[PDB]
Design an enzyme around this catalytic site. Structure first.
Site, PDB file in Angstrom:
ATOM      1  CG  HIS A  97      -2.306   0.606   0.888  1.00 31.35           C
ATOM      2  ND1 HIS A  97      -3.430   0.285   1.620  1.00 31.35           N
ATOM      3  CD2 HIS A  97      -2.707   1.472  -0.070  1.00 31.35           C
ATOM      4  CE1 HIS A  97      -4.474   0.923   1.113  1.00 31.35           C
ATOM      5  NE2 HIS A  97      -4.064   1.652   0.094  1.00 31.35           N
ATOM      6  CG  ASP A 120      -6.285  -0.605   4.784  1.00 33.87           C
ATOM      7  OD1 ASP A 120      -6.024  -1.601   5.494  1.00 33.87           O
ATOM      8  OD2 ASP A 120      -5.413  -0.028   4.098  1.00 33.87           O
ATOM      9  CG  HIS A 122      -4.287  -2.201   8.790  1.00 33.63           C
ATOM     10  ND1 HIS A 122      -4.394  -3.176   7.818  1.00 33.63           N
ATOM     11  CD2 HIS A 122      -3.988  -2.843   9.942  1.00 33.63           C
ATOM     12  CE1 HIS A 122      -4.179  -4.360   8.368  1.00 33.63           C
ATOM     13  NE2 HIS A 122      -3.928  -4.185   9.654  1.00 33.63           N
ATOM     14  CG  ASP A 124      -2.623   1.715   5.536  1.00 31.96           C
ATOM     15  OD1 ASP A 124      -2.502   0.927   6.500  1.00 31.96           O
ATOM     16  OD2 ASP A 124      -2.886   1.323   4.380  1.00 31.96           O
ATOM     17  CG  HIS A 137       2.791  -1.790   4.269  1.00 28.37           C
ATOM     18  ND1 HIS A 137       2.158  -3.011   4.130  1.00 28.37           N
ATOM     19  CD2 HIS A 137       3.354  -1.797   5.501  1.00 28.37           C
ATOM     20  CE1 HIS A 137       2.329  -3.720   5.231  1.00 28.37           C
ATOM     21  NE2 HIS A 137       3.053  -3.008   6.081  1.00 28.37           N
ATOM     22  CG  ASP A 228      -4.928  -3.259   2.525  1.00 32.28           C
ATOM     23  OD1 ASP A 228      -4.846  -4.457   2.171  1.00 32.28           O
ATOM     24  OD2 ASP A 228      -4.152  -2.740   3.373  1.00 32.28           O
ATOM     25  CG  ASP A 230      -5.430  -5.460   5.035  1.00 27.53           C
ATOM     26  OD1 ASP A 230      -6.268  -4.535   5.083  1.00 27.53           O
ATOM     27  OD2 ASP A 230      -4.228  -5.263   5.328  1.00 27.53           O
ATOM     28  CD  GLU A 273      -0.147  -4.352   1.594  1.00 27.95           C
ATOM     29  OE1 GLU A 273       0.388  -5.476   1.684  1.00 27.95           O
ATOM     30  OE2 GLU A 273       0.458  -3.296   1.899  1.00 27.95           O
TER      31      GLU A 273
END
Ligand SMILES: CN[C@](CCCC[B-](O)(O)O)(CCN1CCCCC1)C(=O)O
Ligand SMILES: CN[C@](CCCC[B-](O)(O)O)(CCN1CCCCC1)C(=O)O
Ligand SMILES: CN[C@](CCCC[B-](O)(O)O)(CCN1CCCCC1)C(=O)O
Ligand SMILES: [Mn+2]
Ligand SMILES: [Mn+2]
Ligand SMILES: [Mn+2]
Ligand SMILES: [Mn+2]
Ligand SMILES: [Mn+2]
Ligand SMILES: [Mn+2]
Lengths: 306, 306, 306
Positions: A97, A120, A122, A124, A137, A228, A230, A273
Site C-alpha cells: 500500500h 482497509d 488499517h 495507514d 505501507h 486494501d 485486507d 496487498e
C-alpha cells in the site's frame, strides 16, 4: 469510458516477500476480460519496473527502503498522472500500500480536488515518528494529508511530494487494527472513519450514504478508491500480509464497490496487498485474486442484478 | 481497574470429557497478557481444585453428579464472593456452564441487585423435572430464579443454594436450541430473550439497546455476563460440547462484549464450555480459545478502533 | 396438517450428471423424521420414474431435451394436482429446477390464485429465444407467466402447458446471476425481485415483509415456495450445479422459511438443484442435503426458539 491498468509490483513498503506478485495474480484471475465485458476501453501499461536506489539505508535506524519507496512512487505518479490526463480512470494493481503515495500524488497532479475512499483494516496513517514497524505501507496517508505535514519529517527520496489533500477529503471504511498514535491522529484531525463496529451498527448502506455525503455532498469531485484487500475478512482474502479477523463480508465489499460505481465519479482505483505467496494453498491464492477482480469489476459497473 | 481470574475446571455438569481443560486453553491463548495490555491489574487465582464427592450416584436415576456439582459450586461461590468483596471484577473460566450457579450465587452475595446477561445458544433453564439429559449444565438458571423455586426439587448437595435473582433480571442473547419445557418456562414467566431470529430482525445494536433498557433502564446495576462460547457459530467456535448451527458472527460477539464494557457496569463474567478435546485439529482448538480471549478482552475495553 | 413428499429425480433440464440423486440425498439427511417430529402427517409418493421420449432431439439446435422435460413435467403435474386436491401441502424434491413447470402447473389446477416466492441465485426466466445455454432449468418461469406468452415459442412436448399466473404474482429473493435478457424481462414486465443487493440494503426482515405485502397484502393466497438450494452461499451449499458467490447466509435462509411458515399459507414447496455428485467430499454433499432439510422443516414450523 476508458480504463488504464498499471501493474505496480511494489514490495519495499513492507518486509514480507511475495506481494510483488499481486499484479500478475490479479491479471491471471481474468481482470482485463472482465473490464472489457463491462464496456471499458482498456489501455494496459503492463507491470512497471522501478529504478533501484543504491545503498538505500534505513532512515533513522527504523524506516525501511525510504529512497526506493520514494523513487518508485515518483515514477508511478508520472505514469498515473499521464493516464488520468489522457482521460483514463486509472487502476493500479499492487504491490504493497505504500504505492498509494504515488497513485494519489499522480492522480491529484491532474485532479487536485479529488477525494479518497480508503477501504482497509488499517488507517495507514502512522508517520515516520509514530510507526512501530518502520514499514512505509503503514504510513502512506501521513505523507498526503496537508494538515499533518508539520508532524512529518522529510525522508530521503520524498522531497517531490506535494501534500495538498485535506483531512476532510478522506473517509476510511473497514477499520479494525489501529495503532494508538493513529487513533490520536484520526481524533485530533477530525478524520472521518467507519470502523467495523460502525458497520455493525449502521449497516453498509448507511455507511456508503454517509461517506458520500461527507465527500461529495456539497460538490461533485473525482473519487480515488484505495482498496486494501485486507479490508475483507481473512476467510475471504487469506493471501495478504497483515490479515485481521472480523472483516468485511463478500457482499459488503461488493456493495461498497457498487456505490462507488453508482456515483459516476470514480477516477482512480488501487487494489493493493494481494500476496499470493502467503496463501497456504493455490486455492487460497486464487480466491484472493478472484476477489480482487470482483472488487475492481464492481467498481466499474458489474452488478448483481444483471 | 482490578480483575480477578479464576479457573474453574468443572466437567461434571455434563458428560463429555475435556471441558475441564478450557481454563488452560484460554490462558495459553494469551488471556493474561491481553488483560494487562488493557490496563487491568490482575489477581490470578489459578485453577481451583474442587472437593470430590465419593459415590455421587445419579439423582432420580437421571441427574448426573449432583453432589459434586453442588459442592464445587458452593466452593466456587465462596471464592467469587471474596474476590468481589475485595473489589475485583471477577472473570471465571470454565469448565461447563453449571458453574454459573456458583459464580452468580457468590456474586449476588455482595451485589444483590445484580442483573444477568446470558449469551448462549441455549437457555440452560431446564429443571431437574424437565431435563431430558440429566446434565446440570443445561439447568443452572432454574436454581437461580426466585419465581421458579416452587417448581425446582431439592437436589443432594444443593441445600446451600438460595435463588438470588428475579426472572425480570436476566436477559438471554443468542438462543437457537431450546427444549419445549424451557420455552414454556420463558413464556410463562415472561423472561426476556433475543433469539438468533430476533437478532436477524433487529440487528445486534438494537438487541443490546433493548437489553440494557430492560435491565438498567431505570437504575445502574452491577452486570454479570455469563457467556457460553457455543453462542458463536460452530464455524468460529467448534471446540464445544453442544454446537448448534446458525450462531453469532465474530463481529456480533465482539459487539455484545463492547456494549457490556461501555456500560461501565461489568462486575463478573463467565466464559464457559470451551472444550479443546472436541476440536478435530489443534487449529480448531486454538481458534476457539483465541475467540474466548477476544470476548473477555472486549468485555474489559478492547476496541476495534484502537 | 398433511404433507405429501414427491421425489422428482429430474436431470434433463440441464447438462450436469447427478442432480437426479438430489431426492435420495435429502431423504438420507432425515427429511421424513424431521417433518413427522413437527407433527406433519406424511404421504410419501416415493421417487417418480418419468416416461422417457425416444430421439428427443434438440429444438432449434439449442434447447436440450424438450420433449423429455415436457412429458416429465406433465406427469409430475398430475401427481401434484392429485396431492393438493387431497388436501396435502406438496413438497417436491429435485432434481433440476425445470420441474417447477410441472409443480406450479399441477398446483395451479386447483389453486389458480396461488402466488410464487422464488428463492434462487437466478431468475430462471430466459425464454427459448433468449437462453444462451439451451438448459430448460434456466427457463421455467417463462412458460408460466401469462404476460410473456407472445414471446415464448411452442416447444415439442409443451403443448399441455397453459401459462398459469400473472407477472405480478411472483417475487424473487436472492438474485445475483441474471442474464441481460432476463434483466430486460424483469424490468419490462415490472416483475418484483429482491436481489442480494436489496437484501444487503433492507435486511431479510423487510424483504419478507415487502414480499408478502406485494403478494398477499390484500387477499390470502396459497403460497408456492420454489427454493433453489443455490440461493445459499456456495460455502453453505456447495453441492449444486450453478453456484454463485455471495449468497444467503444460513440465518437468512431460515428466516425466509420461518416467515413462509408464519403466513399459514404454504401450499407447495420445491427444493431443487441439490446435486450430491458435485460435492468434492462426502461432507460437502451431506451439509448441502442437511441444509435442504433445514429449509423444508423451517417452512413447516421448525423454529429457533423452541
Ligand atoms: C497498523 N499498523 C501496522 C500495520 C500496517 C498495515 C499496512 B496496510 O497497507 O496493510 O494497511 C502494524 C503495527 N502493529 C504491528 C503488530 C504489533 C503492534 C503494531 C504498521 O506496520 O504500521
Ligand atoms: C437445550 N438443552 C440441552 C443442552 C444444554 C446445553 C448446556 B449449555 O451450558 O451448553 O448451554 C439439550 C437437550 N437435548 C434434547 C434433545 C436431544 C439433544 C438435546 C440439555 O441437555 O438440557
Ligand atoms: C442465469 N442463466 C443460466 C443459469 C440457469 C440456472 C438455473 B437454476 O435452476 O439453477 O437457477 C446461465 C447463463 N450463462 C450465461 C453466461 C455464461 C454462464 C451463465 C442459464 O443457463 O440460463
Ligand atoms: Mn491493511
Ligand atoms: Mn493498507
Ligand atoms: Mn450452550
Ligand atoms: Mn450454557
Ligand atoms: Mn439457481
Ligand atoms: Mn433455479
Amino acid at each position: 469510458h476508458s480504463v488504464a491498468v498499471i501493474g505496480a509490483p511494489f514490495s519495499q513498503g513492507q518486509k514480507r516477500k511475495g506481494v510483488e506478485h499481486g499484479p500478475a495474480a490479479i491479471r491471471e484471475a481474468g481482470l482485463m476480460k472482465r473490464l472489457s465485458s463491462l464496456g471499458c476501453h482498456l489501455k494496459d501499461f503492463g507491470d512497471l519496473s522501478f529504478t533501484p536506489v543504491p545503498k538505500d539505508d534505513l532512515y533513522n535506524n527504523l524506516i525501511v527502503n525510504p529512497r526506493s519507496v520514494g523513487l518508485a512512487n515518483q515514477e508511478l505518479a508520472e505514469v498515473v498522472s499521464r493516464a488520468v490526463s489522457d482521460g483514463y480512470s486509472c487502476v493500479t494493481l499492487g504491490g504493497d500500500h505504500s504505492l498509494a503515495i504515488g497513485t494519489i500524488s499522480g492522480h491529484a497532479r491532474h485532479c487536485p480536488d479529488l477525494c479518497v475512499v480508503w477501504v482497509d483494516a488499517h488507517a495507514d496513517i502512522n508517520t515516520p515518528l509514530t510507526t512501530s514497524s518502520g514499514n512505509l505501507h503503514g504510513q502512506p496517508v501521513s505523507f498526503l494529508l496537508r494538515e499533518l505535514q508539520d508532524k512529518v519529517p522529510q525522508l530521503p527520496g520524498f522531497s517531490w511530494i506535494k501534500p495538498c489533500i485535506s483531512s476532510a477529503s478522506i473517509v476510511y471504511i473497514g477499520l479494525r487494527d489501529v495503532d494508538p498514535p493513529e487513533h490520536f491522529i484520526l481524533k485530533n484531525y477530525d478524520i472521518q472513519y467507519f470502523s467495523m463496529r460502525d458497520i455493525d451498527r449502521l449497516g453498509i448502506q448507511k455507511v456508503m450514504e454517509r461517506t458520500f455525503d461527507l465527500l461529495i455532498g456539497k460538490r461533485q469531485r473525482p473519487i480515488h478508491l484505495s482498496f486494501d484487500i485486507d479490508a475483507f475478512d481473512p476467510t475471504l482474502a487469506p493471501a495478504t500480509g497483515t490479515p485481521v479477523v472480523g472483516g468485511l463480508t463478500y457482499r459488503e465489499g461488493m456493495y461498497i464497490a457498487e456505490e462507488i460505481h453508482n456515483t459516476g465519479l470514480l477516477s482512480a482505483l488501487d487494489l493493493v496487498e494481494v500476496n499470493p505467496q502467503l496463501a497456504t494453498s493455490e486455492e487460497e491464492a486464487k480466491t484472493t485474486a478472484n476477489l480482487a477482480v470482483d472488487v475492481i469489476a464492481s467498481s466499474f459497473g458489474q452488478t448483481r442484478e444483471g
